[PDB]
């Protein structure tokens, strides 16, 4: 008795959206999780926005999807990881929080915006999600969320 | 230049065979958050083949590779390796390792040789028919 969905989230810092209860209603006569839009995250570490239609049927979202400190994978093993544009191989926006910048030389981070936008970090990130194959979206700084969009993982 | 990275290993192999190649890493080598390999063939732009996290854990690999193709690291030694086997005409080119001092925000910034700081200069591989 697993979910109808066949869709695999046991970590509770994890969500979704759609809920993981309302996916189990969103089946089709065969069997398939069909959305228009998806989002999967972590509560204190960040989130994953999928835009357009995604199947979800039995994707083993503990398996796949990993939102640590400053970083996201999506499909850790390379074989494991579909053609671009199935499962959640496919353009997303990347949101991770907590992004600031470490004073190496007084060992603590620099999170006020007054000092963020002093030392222009903003465009740090900017520069971070070019480099990286995104497009820097966004970036918060009371939180420290750095926001991007991506066309794979 | 805070790292250095030398290629070696490349040569002549007949099709369907096998053959490693090998990097050694020097300078401030714990820096590196990611090694890659890519390479480039007569007349193309060079292309992404293989990488994986310092730790080994997240592998990438270029479609024309995956399962051919193996990247490892031994970090005692500083080296960096890519086991490549049954080869094709089409893997004949210059092979490049390189590594980024950077983190990964996402597991796709492996792809891109942006991501990338430091470079070889590549060891020559020619795959015969």
């Known amino acids: 008795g697993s979910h109808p969905a066949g869709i695999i989230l046991t970590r509770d810092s994890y969500y979704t959206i759609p809920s993981m209860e309302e996916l189990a209603r969103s089946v089709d006569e065969n069997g398939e999780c069909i959305v228009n839009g998806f989002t999967i995250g972590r509560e204190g570490f960040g989130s994953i926005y999928f835009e357009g239609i995604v199947n979800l049927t039995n994707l083993d979202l503990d398996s796949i999807v990993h939102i640590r400190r400053k970083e996201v994978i999506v499909y850790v093993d390379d074989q494991n990881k579909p053609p671009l544009g199935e499962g959640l191989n496919r353009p997303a926006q990347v949101t991770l929080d907590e992004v600031w910048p470490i004073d190496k030389t007084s060992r603590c981070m620099i999170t006020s915006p007054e000092r963020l936008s002093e030392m222009n970090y903003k465009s740090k990130l900017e520069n971070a999600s070019r480099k990286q194959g995104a497009q820097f979206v966004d970036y918060r700084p009371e939180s420290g969320s750095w926001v991007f969009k991506v066309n794979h993982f | 230049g805070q790292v250095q990275l030398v290629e070696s290993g490349g040569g002549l192999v007949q099709a369907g065979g096998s053959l490693r190649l090998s990097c050694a890493a020097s300078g401030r080598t714990f820096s590196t958050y990611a090694m890659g390999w890519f390479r480039q063939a007569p007349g193309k732009e060079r292309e992404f083949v293989s990488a994986?996290?310092?730790?080994?854990?997240?592998?990438r690999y270029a479609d024309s590779v995956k399962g051919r193709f193996t990247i490892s690291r031994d970090n005692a030694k500083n080296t960096v390796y890519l086991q490549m086997n049954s080869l094709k005409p089409e893997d004949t080119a210059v092979y490049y390792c390189?590594?980024?001092?950077?983190?990964?925000?996402?597991?796709?910034?492996?792809?891109?040789?942006?991501?990338?700081?430091?470079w070889g200069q590549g060891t020559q591989v020619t795959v015969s028919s």
């Open positions: 994986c996290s310092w730790s080994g854990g997240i592998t």
């Open positions: 390189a590594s980024a001092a950077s983190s990964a925000a996402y597991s796709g910034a492996y792809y891109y040789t942006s991501y990338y700081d430091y």
